[PDB]
Design an enzyme around this catalytic site. Structure first.
Site, PDB file in Angstrom:
ATOM      1  N   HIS A  47       0.803  -1.222   0.000  1.00 35.36           N
ATOM      2  CA  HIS A  47       0.000   0.000   0.000  1.00 35.36           C
ATOM      3  C   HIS A  47       0.838   1.277   0.000  1.00 35.36           C
ATOM      4  CE1 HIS A  47      -3.008  -2.975   1.154  1.00 35.36           C
ATOM      5  NE2 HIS A  47      -2.309  -3.247   2.241  1.00 35.36           N
ATOM      6  N   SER A 102       1.833  -0.501  -5.253  1.00 40.75           N
ATOM      7  CA  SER A 102       0.884  -0.753  -4.179  1.00 40.75           C
ATOM      8  C   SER A 102       0.333  -2.165  -4.323  1.00 40.75           C
ATOM      9  CB  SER A 102      -0.263   0.267  -4.210  1.00 40.75           C
ATOM     10  OG  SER A 102      -1.157   0.094  -3.111  1.00 40.75           O
ATOM     11  N   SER A 144      -5.673   1.563  -2.040  1.00 40.88           N
ATOM     12  CA  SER A 144      -4.998   1.911  -0.800  1.00 40.88           C
ATOM     13  C   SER A 144      -3.962   3.019  -0.944  1.00 40.88           C
ATOM     14  CB  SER A 144      -4.327   0.674  -0.201  1.00 40.88           C
ATOM     15  OG  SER A 144      -3.328   0.190  -1.078  1.00 40.88           O
ATOM     16  N   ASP A 173       3.364  -7.666   0.431  1.00 43.04           N
ATOM     17  CA  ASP A 173       2.243  -7.513   1.359  1.00 43.04           C
ATOM     18  C   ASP A 173       1.034  -8.176   0.705  1.00 43.04           C
ATOM     19  OD1 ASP A 173      -0.003  -6.734   2.865  1.00 43.04           O
ATOM     20  OD2 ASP A 173       0.888  -4.828   3.443  1.00 43.04           O
ATOM     21  N   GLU A 200       4.563  -9.225   4.689  1.00 45.09           N
ATOM     22  CA  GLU A 200       4.005  -8.332   5.703  1.00 45.09           C
ATOM     23  C   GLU A 200       2.802  -8.913   6.445  1.00 45.09           C
ATOM     24  OE1 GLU A 200       4.995  -5.298   6.669  1.00 45.09           O
ATOM     25  OE2 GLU A 200       3.250  -4.337   7.589  1.00 45.09           O
ATOM     26  N   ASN A 213       4.865 -10.750   9.680  1.00 42.87           N
ATOM     27  CA  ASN A 213       3.573 -10.593  10.339  1.00 42.87           C
ATOM     28  C   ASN A 213       3.603 -11.086  11.780  1.00 42.87           C
ATOM     29  OD1 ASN A 213       0.491 -10.066  10.031  1.00 42.87           O
ATOM     30  ND2 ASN A 213       0.608 -12.133  10.868  1.00 42.87           N
ATOM     31  N   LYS A 215       4.402  -6.563  15.268  1.00 43.30           N
ATOM     32  CA  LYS A 215       3.594  -6.428  14.064  1.00 43.30           C
ATOM     33  C   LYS A 215       2.191  -6.958  14.336  1.00 43.30           C
ATOM     34  CE  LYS A 215       1.791  -6.735   9.880  1.00 43.30           C
ATOM     35  NZ  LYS A 215       0.497  -7.391   9.520  1.00 43.30           N
ATOM     36  N   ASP A 267       0.011  -3.830  14.768  1.00 42.06           N
ATOM     37  CA  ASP A 267      -0.599  -3.538  13.476  1.00 42.06           C
ATOM     38  C   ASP A 267      -1.982  -4.172  13.334  1.00 42.06           C
ATOM     39  OD1 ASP A 267      -1.298  -4.184  10.652  1.00 42.06           O
ATOM     40  OD2 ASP A 267       0.632  -3.252  10.166  1.00 42.06           O
ATOM     41  N   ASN A 268      -2.055  -5.515  13.357  1.00 39.92           N
ATOM     42  CA  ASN A 268      -3.284  -6.196  12.943  1.00 39.92           C
ATOM     43  C   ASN A 268      -4.455  -5.884  13.866  1.00 39.92           C
ATOM     44  OD1 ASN A 268      -1.007  -7.375  11.694  1.00 39.92           O
ATOM     45  ND2 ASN A 268      -2.145  -9.274  11.291  1.00 39.92           N
ATOM     46  N   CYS A 278      -6.458  -1.777  13.169  1.00 42.13           N
ATOM     47  CA  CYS A 278      -7.852  -1.841  12.752  1.00 42.13           C
ATOM     48  C   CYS A 278      -8.769  -1.151  13.755  1.00 42.13           C
ATOM     49  CB  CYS A 278      -8.260  -3.301  12.541  1.00 42.13           C
ATOM     50  SG  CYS A 278      -7.386  -4.061  11.146  1.00 42.13           S
ATOM     51  N   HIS A 298      -7.695  -8.982   3.717  1.00 40.64           N
ATOM     52  CA  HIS A 298      -6.788  -8.530   2.660  1.00 40.64           C
ATOM     53  C   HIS A 298      -7.439  -8.526   1.274  1.00 40.64           C
ATOM     54  CE1 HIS A 298      -2.877  -7.508   0.989  1.00 40.64           C
ATOM     55  NE2 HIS A 298      -3.190  -8.315  -0.010  1.00 40.64           N
ATOM     56  N   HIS A 325      -3.738   2.263   8.758  1.00 44.14           N
ATOM     57  CA  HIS A 325      -3.214   2.413  10.109  1.00 44.14           C
ATOM     58  C   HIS A 325      -2.436   3.723  10.259  1.00 44.14           C
ATOM     59  CE1 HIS A 325      -4.596  -1.537  10.249  1.00 44.14           C
ATOM     60  NE2 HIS A 325      -3.483  -2.216  10.463  1.00 44.14           N
ATOM     61  N   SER A 337       5.554  -2.356  12.513  1.00 44.09           N
ATOM     62  CA  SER A 337       5.584  -3.275  11.377  1.00 44.09           C
ATOM     63  C   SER A 337       6.766  -2.980  10.465  1.00 44.09           C
ATOM     64  CB  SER A 337       4.279  -3.170  10.588  1.00 44.09           C
ATOM     65  OG  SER A 337       3.162  -3.312  11.448  1.00 44.09           O
ATOM     66  N   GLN A 371      10.183  -4.843   9.076  1.00 45.25           N
ATOM     67  CA  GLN A 371      10.484  -4.982   7.652  1.00 45.25           C
ATOM     68  C   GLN A 371      11.925  -4.592   7.348  1.00 45.25           C
ATOM     69  OE1 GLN A 371       9.372  -6.250   5.057  1.00 45.25           O
ATOM     70  NE2 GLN A 371       7.126  -6.390   5.026  1.00 45.25           N
TER      71      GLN A 371
HETATM   72  N1  NAD Z   1      -6.864  -4.161   6.560  1.00 48.36           N
HETATM   73  C1  NAD Z   1      -5.790  -4.208   7.348  1.00 48.36           C
HETATM   74  O1  NAD Z   1      -5.210  -3.195   7.741  1.00 48.36           O
HETATM   75  C2  NAD Z   1      -5.229  -5.561   7.691  1.00 48.36           C
HETATM   76  C3  NAD Z   1      -4.196  -5.688   8.616  1.00 48.36           C
HETATM   77  C4  NAD Z   1      -3.689  -6.939   8.918  1.00 48.36           C
HETATM   78  C5  NAD Z   1      -4.214  -8.048   8.301  1.00 48.36           C
HETATM   79  N2  NAD Z   1      -5.230  -7.909   7.426  1.00 48.36           N
HETATM   80  C6  NAD Z   1      -5.855  -9.093   6.806  1.00 48.36           C
HETATM   81  O2  NAD Z   1      -6.974  -9.461   7.574  1.00 48.36           O
HETATM   82  C7  NAD Z   1      -7.183 -10.891   7.443  1.00 48.36           C
HETATM   83  C8  NAD Z   1      -7.251 -11.543   8.802  1.00 48.36           C
HETATM   84  O3  NAD Z   1      -5.942 -11.454   9.406  1.00 48.36           O
HETATM   85  P1  NAD Z   1      -5.680 -11.827  10.928  1.00 48.36           P
HETATM   86  O4  NAD Z   1      -4.293 -11.503  11.324  1.00 48.36           O
HETATM   87  O5  NAD Z   1      -6.793 -11.334  11.762  1.00 48.36           O
HETATM   88  O6  NAD Z   1      -5.838 -13.416  10.842  1.00 48.36           O
HETATM   89  P2  NAD Z   1      -6.350 -14.411  11.971  1.00 48.36           P
HETATM   90  O7  NAD Z   1      -5.974 -15.813  11.581  1.00 48.36           O
HETATM   91  O8  NAD Z   1      -5.721 -13.980  13.236  1.00 48.36           O
HETATM   92  O9  NAD Z   1      -7.972 -14.316  12.106  1.00 48.36           O
HETATM   93  C9  NAD Z   1      -8.937 -14.659  11.092  1.00 48.36           C
HETATM   94  C10 NAD Z   1     -10.053 -15.315  11.859  1.00 48.36           C
HETATM   95  O10 NAD Z   1     -11.168 -15.586  10.994  1.00 48.36           O
HETATM   96  C11 NAD Z   1     -11.831 -16.715  11.510  1.00 48.36           C
HETATM   97  N3  NAD Z   1     -12.683 -17.260  10.462  1.00 48.36           N
HETATM   98  C12 NAD Z   1     -12.277 -17.945   9.348  1.00 48.36           C
HETATM   99  N4  NAD Z   1     -13.260 -18.327   8.567  1.00 48.36           N
HETATM  100  C13 NAD Z   1     -14.395 -17.870   9.222  1.00 48.36           C
HETATM  101  C14 NAD Z   1     -15.767 -17.976   8.928  1.00 48.36           C
HETATM  102  N5  NAD Z   1     -16.254 -18.620   7.859  1.00 48.36           N
HETATM  103  N6  NAD Z   1     -16.641 -17.406   9.790  1.00 48.36           N
HETATM  104  C15 NAD Z   1     -16.161 -16.780  10.870  1.00 48.36           C
HETATM  105  N7  NAD Z   1     -14.892 -16.625  11.254  1.00 48.36           N
HETATM  106  C16 NAD Z   1     -14.053 -17.201  10.386  1.00 48.36           C
HETATM  107  C17 NAD Z   1     -10.710 -17.649  11.952  1.00 48.36           C
HETATM  108  O11 NAD Z   1     -11.147 -18.590  12.933  1.00 48.36           O
HETATM  109  C18 NAD Z   1      -9.672 -16.657  12.507  1.00 48.36           C
HETATM  110  O12 NAD Z   1      -9.712 -16.538  13.924  1.00 48.36           O
HETATM  111  C19 NAD Z   1      -6.047 -11.398   6.550  1.00 48.36           C
HETATM  112  O13 NAD Z   1      -6.508 -11.415   5.206  1.00 48.36           O
HETATM  113  C20 NAD Z   1      -4.968 -10.333   6.759  1.00 48.36           C
HETATM  114  O14 NAD Z   1      -3.991 -10.297   5.725  1.00 48.36           O
HETATM  115  C21 NAD Z   1      -5.743  -6.704   7.111  1.00 48.36           C
END
Ligand code: NAD
Ligand code: NAD
Ligand code: NAD
Ligand code: NAD
Ligand code: 3S9
Ligand code: ADE
Ligand code: K
Lengths: 462, 464, 460, 461
Positions: free
Chosen positions: B56, B79, B84, B134, B159, B184, B189, B193-194, B198, B318, B377, B385, B389
């Site tokens: 991004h 990106s 993003s 990423d 990432e 990650n 991180k 971050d995660n 959010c 993602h 973020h 994060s 990196q």
């Molecule tokens: N937008 C952002 O800024 C940002 C930041 C970090 C990660 N992400 C993305 O967000 C996503 C989640 O990452 P994360 O670190 O939270 O992963 P994570 O593994 O910690 O959590 C995902 C959760 O979803 C649950 N899940 C899966 N299928 C499901 C379903 N059908 N119904 C209900 N729950 C379900 C799982 O049990 C798990 O606990 C990834 O795609 C990651 O790359 C986005």
């Protein structure tokens, strides 16, 4: 009928304890589900369990689950202040050997553990150990090595106990394998965090009835217990500052909305009064220790604390606070049991209206158990379902019967498999009425898991 | 700055001065990242590094890029999401003479072309030797379309949760060609971050897209991982009544103890494909659904048909396939309110009535809503994060995997995390940025708990 | 000294230790002791007092006595007394008649013991009341005593309502000060006090985990706001019921779902009107209204098995406990905790799973199962009580000519300046530092540098 | 050929209309009035001068007044608060509006004058809707003859009400007013929860700063200070609160905030030495919420931690001494309504200087200046009250009363409690909440009517 193999405060409290046990059963679905699941199989038939853990109502449901699965037990508390006497009475009245009461002396505490180890003056034919903090484990290794020869394993409840086991394993002195019950997620991240959230402010209210909102708190530590403790105080409206030695945990405290401070100027603890941030401590109304470490609320901190501040410890052992300094130098006025005013004017006598005192809870012992009832049944459900599964697994492994060469390959400190952690969690969630979603086959394939789990790699931190 | 510089593609180069002002502010918000600049600039640990970067193109990524450059690296950048990019960030980086191909609102064709512009220089593959990714899209293009370039690349530093999963799948299948570091799963991180990222940016994006009051309304968060945890907090702290769905009973247990009701969109949690398995009464009272899973079709067509009128639908995982937007494109009429905000009229496909009351509001077309409708973020969170990196890039680049014989290569083809000592040092700089004061263990205390005074303070199994 | 009746006089030393601590937690009340001790404004006052005989009330009692008053004291609830507080007060030579776990008949007898001294009406001239029971008894049974009494100071919302009904009806015989509606009382005590003490009492009674469970709070006035927060801060999923749409609006904005026990909110008396699906999911119901039968028989029948039922309004008719006494079997767990078996009236199975847990037999749960509001909150309420006693006593209504009395018979509140002076002492207790306006700033917003800082219409 | 308007860009009208249609679905009390009163036309013959933030939410208010029969001429009450797509949509509807985001002080004045005058002569106005009192002040100072024909003023906000009350005290107020601010569905909805929503909103939009873990100082703890403090605390800020009112300070403590003063022992004597330098040097964010003057003064500004954010959410910008900063320090615009103030001197700055403050909206109302103010569903309550207040005063026809009857009606009043409750009920139903109905026995027991009002007028909620 004829049962005398116990020692409790008051056996006539048994009917009261039984009523609370029956209520607690309805609050513990994972534990009660294990009773229903394994009753017919009797997986603990022939198990003889030495148990050392807080003789609460929740421990009572655990004891009776073990007995319902076939085990015999002899029980003691792992803390002089943590027993609920109605719980101990109900267990003794069920014909189960238990040696425990609230307010034991240090001599009575050791005596109680010894009464579980010995039956009729000789070593009981024990073959399993359930421990919480490692005191029973230590006594067996130091005083009864011949008994460990016939013991299949230890299931250890708490962070401090696990550290003592790993030190034994490191030094080559651990004699039987162990399961680290603490590090199940349905234990560490349920009991250690959420339990203290519930029971810390509970104990403080019962001991002092102090308003907490608007007052200043200092929590020493931000591990699982420190996280739950800080939330316990913040949710009541306290202004909570957090101290830590681990910068990662301190990072979490910052992002969680706490100001991170140290009792020492620039955080350097060099033993002098000059090192103390007197201005910071002079504003603190409540200090809570959560570390499992030694002397994290030291004498110079206690001297600099704001008049009438409350001091308490929710870690496993009382040496987190330099209470020894306070016994040597300051006069103790008992307000009521487990509540003491510590008068900093001198050691010999006090003025009843003196304003320069501290309020110490539980004489520095585990404050949630000493001044309230510890964690609630529905949280202890998770920890004690893990305990039962751990007992079943080590008793079925039968380490004591293995050849020497096979013992060598199995002498370790292990955790329960994640699948079992998840199975305990699911029963807990169902207890709340929560409804878990089932993955479709394509969704399970997409994230690389079986539909029934486990759902996370072993590295996952939750 | 370089004379005649044209090796870039951005939306509007005149935003460059604005971007530079925000980068200078962001540098003050990123002490761990800027600490690595000051500490390592003289040594030039990345001298000779030629980094392909795909993440991004935000102001925060700008500070990361200029840190790598300040440590000696050359980079070519795109990106990893079509929505993003912050256009003033991309302009400031292009104006600094750094090849960047990125703008907010790319098409899918443009998105792929942008990655190829980083891979190619003057029509031929660049002599890249490092990869920063990423989500795994650039990793995939290199393996799939430019496999010979991977012969000169020493490492990938990935990432995000989804990208790491793709790498682990490749490693287990024998198709990964270079070692990788899982950035990650550093605690500074993943658990910064995660989760906290959010928390900050979900309600931010919803406010900027709709300006809806959130207090008092009903939300359903699908997933309770790190992102789902952070998302649920983002909404609960605004006063939403938040329900949480999960497939993982441990994460569901945490949601219960955190004060959320745990529910399923499907009766008894069983999706049998039919409309009759939708909990219509539950979905009919939901004002906002947020997907957080990294899984596929967790807000499906039947859920969309049952949602309360005028509910907001968004995705902060993602990839956009968490929501079945394809179904909505096929069957329902889309009315653009403003960029990355669409009313989706459930009355039919062809026209729509301007005053129809039966629509949903979709944010960022289902793409990562925090970056699509806001700025993702904040700098002080991305500091953690992106410090990881930088350290991951230095480690892999100094390892020189591509220069080893094939035997030694098989021994080091791995996906690793950074050691805990480095995780702790990143965390310390973050704490110092808040003015926090970490206590130093005494020798007797460090001996009592079995740690060194300087750390690490926890066993590798510790979960924080 | 034998002019008292308490549960155990030997608890006095314990009570005195907790009173010494409490004084350190009550800076507004102790400031009044220091500032008025010289004047002795209550010298010659003879106060009949009827309010929960807690440690906090002990500090109020000893403040009034420090300022010159004599008192005769009883509790205003059968379960609210702290026996060590009553003992300490009795041991100091102060007549008090109060213990925890009184019967209804003993409760009435206790009040009668303050009214009578040596078989004769005491020469009382001031009344301090909490809920209006003592006020009611004096008006109905001892109306001639009211001819010597200068005023009533009433503590709580329900009691003020009773005072106004008598005023409207022309049956109120002496002037009263509404202590409840000082801001440092209503918006401190009623709200923040219940936030502290509600989850406290539930934990002490049941030791139930509250996080993750479903609560229904009936009412969202001051007590309902504090009660809802007590539960939400523990992690309960809290739903709120209300009949006042403004209070309901506040609940929505505060992040709560607003529901009714009745379909479309229409309570038409039938079981069919009950939202059985909603009530079947509720783990805890708390009534906060001061109204009658807001947790009624049909709701109790529909409740989720093993739900906790409790009331933190003033009177125990918020829940239809009479229905439960008539129809269901009560199993005492421990004092003030009863399992109520919905299987029938005569007997129960010790392992029956279809029961409710009632706290304090429907009486005020924070005082019945714990210790009520903490000292630092009660500081504000009781500082207002002292000031109101001083004001009415110095007006000497009972000594006025008949024509001067008619103009003086009213229910009034304390001036805002005194409300603010109480608040300042509370703020300093927390170490808070209030800023002082400059003259220009004071002129700009149209107030005095000294205050009051808000018009009387301001709602805070 | 409609030309009686001035907006930034009329081509934004369609985007504005899209957002009005959404806002309508978020404003059920206001749209309920629109549907209930449309046929009766209770504002037929009403000619309203309106001066209030030209937002999308104000757009729905304007079109409700028009739908019930009124004619209006509109301006914004702040130079930064207009949403240009809202102003364009109103103008494109044929409604005279003079408002754009980013006016100068001269343009602001000119816009109000364009509502007062039509074709160079005083409009035949007979009602006033105001927010802050600027329009009311211009009429009293400059157009007394217009006020002779005006039936009343409905005033939105705390500061405007204070100014009305001063005029009433001084005998200078010429027409009666309704204090819309002090409806509970306004003051304890808009002032509090509105700032809860939009304060952290505007700070994120202006700076994108992480707020969790940082130190904030909120000056004031009235309705706006309460909502502002919650806006920051719920993001994880460590929030300290200042107050002059010890009752409000008592609330802050009980709500879990530390109460502090910028000045040692709270004594503001004008010296640098009275500033708590240790405290101010820890603050990452200061927010003024008082409606007072100079509550973030020059000595506070000199002592603040480097790179702290400074902003104001009270009605007027003199809460912060921006005049001092203009005179002494160098301003660097980051982007519109975001300025770095370099404390190194007045003559230029270093682009990489570390000693600066960030000022939002040049000290003007930050929620409207840097974001979109309160959300539609909150403004629903305020603006339903405005419509009802306009109906009430227009129907009283004060301007037509004899002189003796005017004297008896010249006052500043609030709307009755029953109206306040009926507004609240529509808000609650918009959330899907279900209010319970009292039984006759229950209504008798607490002494209220089943339909309300449910509280005495002294009740504070
Ligand atoms: N937008 C952002 O800024 C940002 C930041 C970090 C990660 N992400 C993305 O967000 C996503 C989640 O990452 P994360 O670190 O939270 O992963 P994570 O593994 O910690 O959590 C995902 C959760 O979803 C649950 N899940 C899966 N299928 C499901 C379903 N059908 N119904 C209900 N729950 C379900 C799982 O049990 C798990 O606990 C990834 O795609 C990651 O790359 C986005
Ligand atoms: N009372 C209870 O109910 C209960 C429940 C669980 C565990 N415990 C006990 O509480 C203790 C802590 O358990 P845990 O699981 O949280 O362990 P933990 O490892 O998760 O956390 C302890 C924390 O203390 C910090 N710490 C250590 N020394 C410190 C110092 N000098 N200053 C500040 N912080 C310091 C460490 O950095 C660590 O983060 C153990 O003794 C454990 O047995 C008690
Ligand atoms: N236990 C304590 O410590 C304590 C403290 C203060 C007051 N009280 C008592 O609590 C009660 C309430 O006091 P308050 O100050 O909050 O009064 P209040 O007038 O502020 O609140 C009562 C609320 O109940 C609501 N209500 C009435 N009937 C209802 C019904 N059928 N369903 C739902 N809601 C309904 C009303 O609309 C009102 O908002 C009084 O009896 C008072 O004396 C108890
Ligand atoms: N931006 C918005 O959306 C919005 C909304 C409503 C009101 N307002 C404006 O905000 C201002 C405040 O309105 P309100 O309803 O909160 O008024 P309020 O009277 O309820 O509160 C203002 C508070 O400021 C305190 N105060 C005054 N001088 C002080 C000082 N020197 N230091 C500290 N505290 C001090 C007062 O004690 C008072 O409690 C007014 O100008 C009002 O018009 C803005
Ligand atoms: N028909 C119709 C619309 N009526 C309605 O919904 O109520 C309008 C209304 C709003 C706010 C206060 C009082 C009435
Ligand atoms: N959105 C908004 N519209 C009009 N006036 C406002 N005051 C605060 N927010 C507002
Ligand atoms: K317990």
């Amino acid at each position: 009928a004829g049962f005398t193999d116990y020692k409790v405060a008051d056996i006539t409290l048994a009917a009261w304890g039984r009523r609370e046990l029956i209520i607690a059963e309805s609050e513990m679905p994972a534990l009660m589900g294990l009773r229903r699941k394994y009753a017919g199989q009797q997986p603990l038939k022939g198990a003889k369990i030495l148990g050392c853990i807080h003789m609460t109502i929740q421990t009572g449901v655990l004891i009776e689950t073990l007995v319902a699965l076939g085990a015999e037990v002899r029980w003691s508390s792992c803390n002089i202040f943590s027993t609920q006497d109605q719980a101990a009475a109900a267990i003794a009245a069920a014909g189960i050997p238990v040696f425990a009461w609230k307010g034991e002396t240090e001599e009575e505490y050791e005596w109680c553990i010894e009464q579980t180890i010995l039956k009729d003056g000789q070593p009981w034919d024990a073959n399993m150990v359930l421990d919480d903090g490692g005191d029973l484990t230590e006594i067996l290794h130091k005083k009864y090595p011949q008994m460990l020869e016939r013991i299949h394993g230890i299931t250890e409840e708490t962070t401090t106990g696990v550290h003592r086991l790993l030190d034994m394993l490191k030094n080559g002195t651990l004699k039987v394998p162990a399961i680290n019950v603490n590090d199940s997620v349905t234990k560490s991240k349920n009991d250690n965090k959420y339990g203290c959230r519930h029971s810390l402010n509970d104990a403080i209210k019962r001991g002092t009835d102090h308003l907490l909102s608007g007052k200043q708190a200092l929590v020493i530590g931000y591990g699982d217990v420190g996280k739950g403790s800080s939330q316990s105080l913040r949710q009541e409206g306290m202004i909570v500052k957090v101290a830590e030695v681990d910068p990662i945990c301190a990072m979490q405290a910052c992002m969680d909305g706490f100001e991170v401070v140290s009792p020492y100027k620039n955080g350097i603890n060099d033993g002098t009064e000059a090192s103390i941030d007197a201005a910071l401590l002079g504003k603190i109304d409540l200090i809570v220790t959560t570390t499992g470490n030694v002397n994290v609320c030291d004498a110079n901190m206690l001297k600099a604390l704001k008049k009438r501040a409350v001091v308490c410890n929710i870690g496993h052992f009382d040496n987190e606070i330099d209470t020894a300094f306070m016994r040597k130098n300051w006069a103790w006025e008992e307000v009521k049991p487990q509540v003491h005013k510590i008068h900093r004017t001198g050691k010999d006598g006090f003025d009843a209206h003196n304003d320069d005192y501290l309020i110490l809870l539980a004489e520095g012992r585990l404050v949630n158990l000493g001044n309230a009832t510890g964690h609630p049944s529905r949280i202890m459900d998770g920890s004690f379902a893990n305990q039962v599964l751990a007992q079943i697994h080590l008793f079925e492994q039968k380490y004591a019967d293995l050849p020497a060469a096979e013992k060598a390959k199995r002498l370790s400190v292990e955790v329960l498999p994640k699948k079992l952690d998840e199975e305990v969690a699911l029963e807990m969630v169902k207890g709340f009425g929560g409804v878990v979603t089932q993955l479709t086959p394509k969704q399970a394939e997409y994230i690389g898991v079986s539909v029934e789990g486990p759902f996370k790699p072993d590295t996952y931190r939750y």
